[PDB]
Amino acid sequence: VTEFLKPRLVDIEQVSSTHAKVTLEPLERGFGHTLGNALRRILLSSMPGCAVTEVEIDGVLHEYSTKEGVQEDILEILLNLKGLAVRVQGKDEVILTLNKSGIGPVTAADITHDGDVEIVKPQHVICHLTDENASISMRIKVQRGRGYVPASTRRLLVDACYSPVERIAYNVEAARVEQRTDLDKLVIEMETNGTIDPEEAIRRAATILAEQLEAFVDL
Amino acid sequence: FLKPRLVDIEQVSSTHAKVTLEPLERGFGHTLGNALRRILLSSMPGCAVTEVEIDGVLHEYSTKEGVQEDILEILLNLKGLAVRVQGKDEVILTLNKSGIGPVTAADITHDGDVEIVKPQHVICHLTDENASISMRIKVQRGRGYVPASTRIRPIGRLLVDACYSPVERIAYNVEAARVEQRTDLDKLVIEMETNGTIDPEEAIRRAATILAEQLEAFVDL
Amino acid sequence: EIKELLKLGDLPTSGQIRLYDGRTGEQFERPVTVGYMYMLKLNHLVDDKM
Amino acid sequence: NKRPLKSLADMIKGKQGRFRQNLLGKRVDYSGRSVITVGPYLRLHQCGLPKKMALELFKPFIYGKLELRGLATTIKAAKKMVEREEAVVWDILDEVIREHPVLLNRAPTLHRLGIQAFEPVLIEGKAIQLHPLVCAAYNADFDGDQMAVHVPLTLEAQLEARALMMSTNNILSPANGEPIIVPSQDVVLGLYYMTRDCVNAKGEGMVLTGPKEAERLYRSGLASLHARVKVRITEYEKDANGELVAKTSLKDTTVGRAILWMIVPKGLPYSIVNQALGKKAISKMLNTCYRILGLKPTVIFADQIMYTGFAYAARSGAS
Amino acid sequence: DSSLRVPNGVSGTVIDVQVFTRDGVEKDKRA
Amino acid sequence: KPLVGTGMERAVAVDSGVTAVAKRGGVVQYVDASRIVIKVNEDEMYPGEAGIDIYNLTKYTRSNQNTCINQMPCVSLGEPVERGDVLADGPSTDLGELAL
Amino acid sequence: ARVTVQDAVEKIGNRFDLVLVAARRARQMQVGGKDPLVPEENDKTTVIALREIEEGLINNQILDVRERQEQQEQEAAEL
RNA sequence: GCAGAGGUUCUAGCUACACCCUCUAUAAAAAACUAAGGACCACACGA
Ligand SMILES: [Mg+2]
């Protein structure tokens, strides 16, 4: 009576490394929704990840302001920063500087290493400069958070998307292995900022969920 | 992260209890509560009756003299009794009653392992002086609800729809815990309602085992 | 009279309560109307129509 | 019974006469009826259909496949096998329903779109499942409404049903250019609730990287579905000679309107999802999508918009 | 081979079988 | 029974022939799923040929629309019964109230 | 599998001759031993004919000239 | 396997929509098998 139809991977369509679509055919009735919602919440609200949380402009102190020589407002400048996918080592916090001048876009590859900090998107655009004398420089603060911490709950404060996932949507339709009941067919499409593989991110979320029930496994 | 534990099990009543899990953070509370509730309500191994044979009743819709109600209502009352077994996966319950008086589940000639958790559950009322009903109740374990029309011999055998579901109402509440020194910790209390055939602690533990094993489809231990 | 009858029990006088999703598990905003209405079952069963 | 007895002219004239009863429109084989069911999980190119109905309608096809595969030597043995509903018969049945359209047909076929083709999806049950979008085209309710299913037999019949009668091929009603598969009753309510705004809602004010971040905030529950927040969108326009150019800007909007942006195809502009999105707005949206993107993107967009409307109407709890 | 058969699809259990036989012809064992 | 109704369900059930109303009051000497025996009271019975009332409830019977006309007893042994009272819950009937 | 025949009708701008040509193609595939040029994906003849038309290599002119050539080598078979 | 008969079963089985083998005036070594009929008027109800 304790036996269950454990799912087996059948075809995982590997979209470009920032996107994936993982599905399971067998599973159980009503278990598709359970697993889909559990994974979605568990990796969308609590995941160990690194993201920007606080930015300081050397020449700007108030948000309702803008530097000369940049066509993007600092409101939009922080918008690019919050999407900057960054992976860090055992250090829980590091300050990232972006001392750069001259005419041209400020790609994420121009961020100073400041150790072994890795940027998975060197070509990511942060801001554009159009004046030779114009210089942009800011300090970036990142921490290994455990979910999403909006700026409304707390110097320029930028929304911190610590979790590496960008979008989760599970669709549960019917799959009949052999000729049984209409068992759930969980298909999960996932998009990740790039710090970890979407498959690796789902595996990490499942490890977290099972590791949450270590004492509940009947020894 | 933090590990929930069986901090408390408030057995408020004989049927339904109030289990408590203490250490949980943002999301975990609601996620784990909803997952546990869905696992419990979906697939919990019950021991509901599935097959009844009456001594002298040919089919499901006939009626024997001396019984208050129809045989169909007798079968539907039999489906309502809560019975749990320990050793045998399959057990046959013999009910022999005579004389005027309601036929409660207490008079079932139970075996060593099988025992009725609600002896007051009435099945039928005998009315005539020389009225005797002798039924052989077949009770087997199972998971979920399977009707008698979607399964798999003598004409005298009566099939009652199987109702293998010990739990009937699972409600969970996520509220802040009372840890020694910490914030953003919530406790999950589950107000699970059972017919009495399952222990709430073992029910929660088995549901969690099912959930954990379902996660092993792509994750090693 | 109906409002007073709801107030007699623990149920709210508004007649509609917050419901949590069966799958997602988070409550529906704009609490929905629930109640025990007497609804029949007509003899136009699908079994006859195939 | 003291009634006029039918003559040699009473059977050539009138409703019951040979012409209008047996020549103009005549009863047909390979036909079945049942009440209809919503089944929102379907796509409008397909419909649900009971196993018994697929077994009975496609009996000659099942017999042919059994003879071809040698499961039954003779039609007679194969017919007995179909009666036994042996498991091998269901696997054979799934092969003859892969790309075999059936003509869903409501009884009062007032106009051309009354009968449409569908790829049957084998469902367990006894009620035909009709796609929610095509209910408006069928003028079909879910209150005991029954519609017949006809099975095209020849390659010409199935092929022309697929090419013409498919609900994917019937988006604009013959009466007028306006779309006929427009979100009608419930999905439109879900979209309308989605595309609104509180003047003070949870998670209002912060700037969002894109629709993905809007979905992340809504699902996590830390931002209301409809809160006025500025988002960054990659709006695609085909102002070039068929090439789609990308325009990125911070358009003030709500979270709910940002959710729909990932649903709409690339070509559509953002000005069409930035309103309350009532029935007329959605009709205009679908018409613009058909006139710009084409047919297949319009079909995919209609399916996705139906999915999101139903899902967020369920999440809305609009009691 | 004209025996009465249950229609396809419908099922259930027989509750009673009543037989009416005209006078003159001998009734079978079940009658 | 319907939780919300009109109060005419009892009137419709009693007036219709689906239920087994008690022509004479008394006490239920013997009740069975197929028969109900009513012991008529001394002040409600005729001097001659009164005896006691016997009600043979109709068991599962084929109906015009292929439904079951089932009558289940609504009383137990020794329950007093007055004149014009409901005794058997016919089809779609509960406690003498029309329960469709 | 296929859902719509739009690109096919931009390939064949009739919406009616398309049915005729794909029906002839399906007839060739079923009655004859003709091998579909696009490899099937567990697809029926009536939809693989539309797949063939979609790639543009099969229409009325190519089908007609192909069957004409087959008839030509049918006369030439006996020399 | 196209006009008939026979065969091991079970009266009869020759493609009758129909299932195996033989030949053109002769009957048996052989297992899976079998049947080809059926209107109108009224009532009520559903969309
Ligand atoms: Mg209707």
Ramachandran sector of residue D315 (left: φ over 0; alpha: ψ -120 to 50; beta: rest)? alpha
d(CA B106, CA B123): 10
Q: What is the CA radius of gyration of chain G?
A: 13
* D177 torsion bin: left (phi>0), alpha (psi -120 to 50), beta (else): alpha
- Strand-strand pairing, A125-129 and A104-107: antiparallel
Q: What share of chain E is helix, strand, coil (3-state, %, to 5)?
A: 0, 0, 100
> Under a CB-based contact definition with an 8 Å cutoff, are residues A83 and A124 in contact?
yes
The answer to whether the beta carbons of residues D132 and D40 sit under 8 Å apart is: yes
Residue with tokens 């943002």: B26
C-alpha to C-alpha distance for D184 and D170, rounded to whole angstroms: 16
Q: What is the CA D154 to C1' H36 distance in angstroms?
A: 26
Q: Are D139 and D110 in contact (CB under 8 A)?
A: yes
Instruction: Return d(Cα B28, Cα D308) in angstroms, integer.
Output: 26
Q: Secondary structure of chain D: what % helix, strand, coil (to 5)?
A: 40, 20, 40
User: Side chain identity at A66, as an amino acid letter?
Assistant: T
Rounded distance between C-alpha atoms, residue A173 and residue A4, angstroms: 19
Calpha distance B141→B165 (Å, rounded): 10
Q: Using alpha carbons, list the distances in angstroms from residue A117 to A108, A126, A165, B152.
A: 12, 17, 20, 63
Q: Of B118, B112, B120, B122, which is closest to residue B91 (Cα–Cα)?
A: B112
Q: Could you give the CA distance from residue A194 to residue A215 in angstroms, rounded to a whole number?
A: 33
F34 to chain B: which residues are within 8 Å by CB? 63, 65
* Chain D window 266-305, residues with Cβ within 7 A of nucleic strand H: none
CA atoms of F10 and F81, how far apart (whole Å): 16
CA end-to-end span of chain F, whole Å? Answer: 8
From chain A, the residues in CB contact with B206 under 8 A are 2, 218
Token duo for residue B50: 């599935």
- The whole-angstrom separation of Cα D291 and Cα D288 is 5
What one-letter code names the amino acid at B123? Answer: I
Does D touch C (3+ CB pairs < 8 Å)?
yes
Cross-strand partners of B102 = B125
Amino acid at E15: I
Element (H, E) at A44: helix A31-44
Print the domain residue range for A119. 49-161
User: Strand H nucleotides below 7 A of a protein CB?
Assistant: 18-19, 32-35, 40-41, 45-47
A 10 A CB-CB count for D277 gives 26
- Cα separation, B86 vs B198, whole angstroms: 11
- Among B30, B37, B38, the residue with its CB nearest the CB of C26 is B30
CB of D38 closer than 8 Å to CB of D142: yes
**Residue among D94, C23, D124, D89 nearest A181 (CA):** D124
Q: Number of helices (H) and strands (E), helices first, in chain A?
A: 3, 15
Q: Say which residue the tokens 């697939």 belong to.
A: B43
Q: What is the CATH number of the domain that holds B52?
A: 2.170.120.12
C-alpha to C-alpha distance for A46 and A209, rounded to whole angstroms: 11
Q: Which residue has the tokens 């959930």?
A: B211
Residue D35 beta carbon within 7 A of nucleic strand H: no
Distance CA A111, CA A132 (A): 19
| D146 Cβ contacts chain H strand, under 7 Å | yes
Q: Which residues of E touch B61 (CB under 8 A)?
A: 13, 15
* Strand order across the beta sheet in which A165-175 lies: A19-23, A183-192, A165-175
Give the residue extent of every domain in chain G.
5-76
Q: What is the DSSP string of A105-152?
A: EEEGGGS--TTT-EES-TT-EEEEE--SS-EE-EEEEEEEEESEE-GG
Is the CB of D1 less than 7 A from some atom of nucleic acid strand H? yes
Could you give the angle at which helices D59-69 and D75-84 cross, rounded to 10 degrees? 120
Decide: helix, strand or coil at residue A21. strand
Residues 6+ apart with CB under 8 A from D285: D264, D268, D272, D273, D277
Which value, in Å, is the radius of gyration of the alpha carbons in chain F? 14
D110: phi then psi, degrees, rounded to nearest 5: -65, -45
F65 inside 8 A of chain C by CB: yes
**B149–E11 C-beta distance less than 8 A:** yes
Quickly list H helices, F1-100: 9-15
The token duo for D6 is 């039918």
Rounded to the nearest angstrom, the distance between the alpha carbon of D146 and the centre of ligand 1 is 9
Q: At what angle do helices D279-292 and D186-194 cross, to 10 degrees?
A: 90
In D114-214, the DSSP E strands lie at 115-123, 128-129, 146-150
Cα angle A13-A17-A19, degrees, rounded to a multiple of 5? 60
- Strand ordering across the sheet containing F80-81: F53-56, F35-40, F26-31, F80-81
Select from 1.10.10.10, 3.30.230.10, 2.40.50.100, 3.40.50.360 the CATH code of F18-92: 2.40.50.100
Domain G5-76 superfamily per CATH: RNA polymerase subunit, RPB6/omega (3.90.940.10)
d(CA B37, CA C20): 12
Q: A107: closest CA among A80, A79, A140?
A: A80
- Looking only at the bridges linking them, the beta strands covering A138-146 and A48-57 are antiparallel
**D74 CB contact with strand H at below 7 Å:** yes
Strands (E), B55-152: 83-84, 90-98, 101-104, 108-109, 115-116, 122-126, 132-140, 142-143
